[PDB]
Amino acid sequence: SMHSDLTFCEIILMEMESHDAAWPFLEPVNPRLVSGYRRIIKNPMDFSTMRHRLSRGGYTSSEEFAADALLVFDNCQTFNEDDSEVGKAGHIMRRFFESRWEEFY
Numbered sequence: 001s002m003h004s005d006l007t008f009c010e011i012i013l014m015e016m017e018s019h020d021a022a023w024p025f026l027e028p029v030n031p032r033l034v035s036g037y038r039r040i041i042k043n044p045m046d047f048s049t050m051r052h053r054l055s056r057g058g059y060t061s062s063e064e065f066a067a068d069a070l071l072v073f074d075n076c077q078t079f080n081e082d083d084s085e086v087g088k089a090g091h092i093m094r095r096f097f098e099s100r101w102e103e104f105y
């Protein structure tokens with residue numbers, strides 16, 4: 001399971017999930033609601049997947065955790081227009097994540 005040295009990542013993820021702009025990213029992009037996603041996006045990522053990977057020992061390091069966070073935001077900018085609701089949310093969340101990351105380090 002998660003090593004205690006990564007508790008700061010667990011907290012950042014919890015705070016991301018609680019944010020106003022997190023709604024598009026809480027769960028895997030859902031084919032019932034969004035068409036054509038995996039056609040474009042080779043490596044989907046979302047906060048629930050991250051939460052499980054982190055809590056069960058799937059991230060050895062904070063760098064691996066951060067890489068998945070950035071994958072959420074990179075996928076969002078690949079799939080969505082910048083002025084779409086989801087596109088705007090991705091930019092908000094990237095800034096929020098980077099601020100919290102820099103605050104710890």
Ligand SMILES: C/N=C(\NC)NC1CCN(CC(=O)NCc2ccc3[nH]c(-c4cnnn4C)nc3c2)CC1
Nearest residue numbers: 020021023024025029030033034075076079080086
């Ligand atoms: C906290 N709730 C908010 N606060 C502003 N507003 C909601 C209002 C209702 N309504 C729902 C909606 O639309 N449910 C479909 C859905 C859900 C998750 C998605 N995730 C992506 C996505 C991720 N990456 N690319 N996409 C295209 N599309 C999604 C579509 C919008 C949210």
